[PDB]
Each structure stands twice: as C-alpha cells, then as structure tokens.
Design an enzyme around this catalytic site. Structure first.
Site, PDB file in Angstrom:
ATOM      1  CG  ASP A 117      -1.916   1.079   1.309  1.00  0.00           C
ATOM      2  OD1 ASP A 117      -2.750   1.017   2.223  1.00  0.00           O
ATOM      3  OD2 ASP A 117      -1.893   2.021   0.484  1.00  0.00           O
ATOM      4  CB  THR A 118       2.166   3.432  -2.726  1.00  0.00           C
ATOM      5  OG1 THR A 118       0.942   3.580  -3.468  1.00  0.00           O
ATOM      6  CG2 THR A 118       3.005   2.298  -3.358  1.00  0.00           C
ATOM      7  N   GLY A 119      -0.119   4.221  -0.325  1.00  0.00           N
ATOM      8  CA  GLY A 119      -0.788   5.340   0.301  1.00  0.00           C
ATOM      9  C   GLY A 119      -0.708   5.283   1.808  1.00  0.00           C
TER      10      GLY A 119
HETATM   11  N1  LIG Z   1      -5.380   2.169   2.055  1.00  0.00           N
HETATM   12  C1  LIG Z   1      -6.473   1.170   1.854  1.00  0.00           C
HETATM   13  C2  LIG Z   1      -6.514   0.177   3.016  1.00  0.00           C
HETATM   14  C3  LIG Z   1      -7.667  -0.855   2.738  1.00  0.00           C
HETATM   15  C4  LIG Z   1      -7.724  -1.797   1.518  1.00  0.00           C
HETATM   16  C5  LIG Z   1      -8.827  -2.758   1.292  1.00  0.00           C
HETATM   17  C6  LIG Z   1      -9.948  -2.822   2.284  1.00  0.00           C
HETATM   18  N2  LIG Z   1     -11.060  -3.779   2.082  1.00  0.00           N
HETATM   19  O1  LIG Z   1     -11.126  -4.552   1.109  1.00  0.00           O
HETATM   20  O2  LIG Z   1     -11.894  -3.815   2.842  1.00  0.00           O
HETATM   21  C7  LIG Z   1      -9.866  -1.877   3.476  1.00  0.00           C
HETATM   22  C8  LIG Z   1      -8.753  -0.898   3.721  1.00  0.00           C
HETATM   23  C9  LIG Z   1      -7.820   1.859   1.793  1.00  0.00           C
HETATM   24  O3  LIG Z   1      -8.188   2.652   2.666  1.00  0.00           O
HETATM   25  N3  LIG Z   1      -8.556   1.513   0.749  1.00  0.00           N
HETATM   26  C10 LIG Z   1      -9.876   2.048   0.524  1.00  0.00           C
HETATM   27  C11 LIG Z   1      -9.761   3.399  -0.181  1.00  0.00           C
HETATM   28  C12 LIG Z   1     -11.060   3.979  -0.666  1.00  0.00           C
HETATM   29  C13 LIG Z   1     -11.565   3.268  -1.900  1.00  0.00           C
HETATM   30  O4  LIG Z   1     -10.723   2.856  -2.723  1.00  0.00           O
HETATM   31  O5  LIG Z   1     -12.799   3.122  -2.051  1.00  0.00           O
HETATM   32  C14 LIG Z   1     -10.671   1.057  -0.312  1.00  0.00           C
HETATM   33  O6  LIG Z   1     -11.918   1.103  -0.229  1.00  0.00           O
HETATM   34  O7  LIG Z   1     -10.048   0.247  -1.045  1.00  0.00           O
HETATM   35  N1  LIG Z   2      -4.792   4.398   1.990  1.00  0.00           N
HETATM   36  C1  LIG Z   2      -4.333   5.566   2.795  1.00  0.00           C
HETATM   37  C2  LIG Z   2      -5.217   6.781   2.512  1.00  0.00           C
HETATM   38  C3  LIG Z   2      -4.686   7.948   3.400  1.00  0.00           C
HETATM   39  C4  LIG Z   2      -3.258   8.505   3.309  1.00  0.00           C
HETATM   40  C5  LIG Z   2      -2.772   9.596   4.159  1.00  0.00           C
HETATM   41  C6  LIG Z   2      -3.692  10.198   5.171  1.00  0.00           C
HETATM   42  N2  LIG Z   2      -3.200  11.297   6.027  1.00  0.00           N
HETATM   43  O1  LIG Z   2      -2.047  11.743   5.955  1.00  0.00           O
HETATM   44  O2  LIG Z   2      -3.894  11.751   6.789  1.00  0.00           O
HETATM   45  C7  LIG Z   2      -5.111   9.633   5.245  1.00  0.00           C
HETATM   46  C8  LIG Z   2      -5.622   8.513   4.378  1.00  0.00           C
HETATM   47  C9  LIG Z   2      -4.417   5.240   4.283  1.00  0.00           C
HETATM   48  O3  LIG Z   2      -5.391   4.656   4.757  1.00  0.00           O
HETATM   49  N3  LIG Z   2      -3.382   5.649   5.008  1.00  0.00           N
HETATM   50  C10 LIG Z   2      -3.301   5.442   6.445  1.00  0.00           C
HETATM   51  C11 LIG Z   2      -2.908   3.993   6.743  1.00  0.00           C
HETATM   52  C12 LIG Z   2      -2.568   3.693   8.197  1.00  0.00           C
HETATM   53  C13 LIG Z   2      -1.207   4.226   8.601  1.00  0.00           C
HETATM   54  O4  LIG Z   2      -0.254   4.074   7.808  1.00  0.00           O
HETATM   55  O5  LIG Z   2      -1.085   4.790   9.709  1.00  0.00           O
HETATM   56  C14 LIG Z   2      -2.264   6.404   7.010  1.00  0.00           C
HETATM   57  O6  LIG Z   2      -2.333   6.709   8.216  1.00  0.00           O
HETATM   58  O7  LIG Z   2      -1.390   6.839   6.231  1.00  0.00           O
END
Ligand SMILES: N[C@@H](Cc1ccc([N+](=O)[O-])cc1)C(=O)N[C@@H](CCC(=O)O)C(=O)O
Ligand SMILES: N[C@@H](Cc1ccc([N+](=O)[O-])cc1)C(=O)N[C@@H](CCC(=O)O)C(=O)O
EC number: 3.4.23.16
Length: 198
Positions: A124-126
């Site tokens: 997960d790059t995000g």
């Molecule tokens: N960063 C991801 C973490 C995540 C991936 C997959 C699930 N899931 O299948 O239930 C939960 C958390 C994330 O927050 N993904 C979200 C981002 C919003 C979106 O793409 O609709 C996700 O729904 O995949």
């Molecule tokens: N998939 C990401 C979406 C996201 C990235 C960055 C922020 N932020 O800086 O506030 C909010 C949402 C995601 O769910 N990132 C989380 C994953 C949990 C973690 O690494 O602590 C994030 O906190 O970066």
C-alpha cells in the site's frame, strides 16, 4: 517516471478544470477526492477504509490528468483526509510496483511471514505505516492511534519487528489493530526497494 517511496508519492492532477495534489495509492481500489466542485449527475455511495466508512458522491466518466497522463473513470467525492488516486485510474497510466514487477489490475497482495506466522498483506503506497490484523506478537508494545479514510483506530505499536515480505527481509515498526486488511506501508516498502513506475 519511476518513483521511490521514501516520501509520499504525490502527483499533480487536473480535474474539473481545477489543479490538485493527490496520493498515488496502490492500496485503494477507488479514486477518492476531497469535497470539490464537479459538474453532472452522481450516485450516493458508501466506501470503507481504516477508521470505518464515509459517504461519497460517485461521478462516472470523469476525465482526470494525472501527472500529465490522461485517464477517464470513476471518481468518488467525499470526506477523505487526502486525495487518493486508486487502482481504477492507476492502471490507465500504466502504473507498476517494482521490488518482481507488479501491475495493478488486481490488488497487490504478497505473502508475509511475521511472528512465526504466514499472512497475506497488501502493498500500500498510500500508507505511511504498516498495519496488521489482530495477531499474536511477542514483546512490549505502545498504545497509538492512526487515521484512515473513515476515522481512526487504536493500535498496538511494536518496534524492531522482523518481517519477510515476499521473501525479502525487513525490520521495522508494525502496528496491530482493527484494520480491515493487512497493509504493508512505506516504512517497510522502502526496505525491500519498492518503486512506483508509470
Ligand atoms: N489504504 C487502503 C486500506 C484498505 C484496503 C482494502 C480494504 N477492504 O477490502 O476492505 C480496506 C482498507 C484503503 O483505505 N482503501 C480504501 C480506499 C477507498 C476506496 O478505494 O474506495 C478502499 O476502499 O479500497
Ligand atoms: N490508503 C491511505 C489513505 C490515506 C493517506 C494519508 C492520510 N493522512 O495523511 O492523513 C489519510 C488517508 C491510508 O489509509 N493511510 C493510512 C494507513 C494507516 C497508517 O499508515 O497509519 C495512514 O495513516 O497513512
């Protein structure tokens, strides 16, 4: 362009005539943008993430220029803490994950071994941090809270944890708590030399 993950992978995008910054997020199935002005019809939708869920407006056939590359697809608009470019659009700009090469037509899952146990996790790059489903880990930990698209969750923070990600060893911080999916974040992705390419 190729990009390392020592910093969040932000790109400039143009959508609805407006310029914005967005995070290239391999862990997101969808593209979700902060409240903004878009023209046309939309459908009410609910999406989840760490923290829970949020209601968004679903716009289809939206043209978006991501780092200069054009893509058309679905864009969700709602209360996300950060603008995210998900796999639905990443595949259109030919984005790949490199560490083997991984395309994004499917979620980028890898097998990991941690605490003597085998699990699957999402590259997960995000995500800044690595977050795993409740599990048995040895040692001391510290209380911590982290945020995601739907709010926040409390997790246990374990440091100096050894994890084998797809065969590659890394040592670092691992958070354990109520995440819906095991996520390998940038803190560990940089150690296995993962790069984002498009
Ligand atoms: N960063 C991801 C973490 C995540 C991936 C997959 C699930 N899931 O299948 O239930 C939960 C958390 C994330 O927050 N993904 C979200 C981002 C919003 C979106 O793409 O609709 C996700 O729904 O995949
Ligand atoms: N998939 C990401 C979406 C996201 C990235 C960055 C922020 N932020 O800086 O506030 C909010 C949402 C995601 O769910 N990132 C989380 C994953 C949990 C973690 O690494 O602590 C994030 O906190 O970066």
């Amino acid at each position: 362009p190729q990009v390392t993950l020592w910093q969040r992978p932000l790109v400039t995008i143009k959508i609805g005539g407006q310029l914005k910054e967005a995070l290239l997020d391999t862990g997101a199935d969808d593209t979700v943008l902060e409240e903004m002005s878009l023209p046309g019809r939309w459908k009410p939708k609910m999406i989840g993430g760490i923290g829970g869920f949020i209601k968004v407006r679903q716009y289809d056939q939206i043209l978006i220029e991501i780092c200069g590359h054009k893509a058309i697809g679905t864009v969700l608009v709602g209360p996300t803490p950060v603008n995210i470019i998900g796999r639905n659009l990443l595949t259109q700009i030919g984005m790949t994950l490199n560490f083997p090469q991984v395309t994004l037509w499917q979620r980028p899952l890898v097998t990991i071994k941690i605490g003597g146990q085998l699990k699957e996790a999402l590259l997960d790059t995000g995500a800044d941090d690595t977050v795993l489903e409740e599990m048995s880990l040895p040692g001391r930990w510290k209380p911590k809270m982290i945020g995601g698209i739907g709010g926040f969750i409390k997790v246990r923070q374990y440091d100096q944890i050894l994890i084998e990600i797809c065969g590659h060893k890394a040592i670092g911080t691992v958070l354990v708590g109520p995440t819906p999916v095991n996520i390998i974040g940038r803190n560990l992705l940089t150690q296995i030399g993962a790069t984002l390419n498009f």
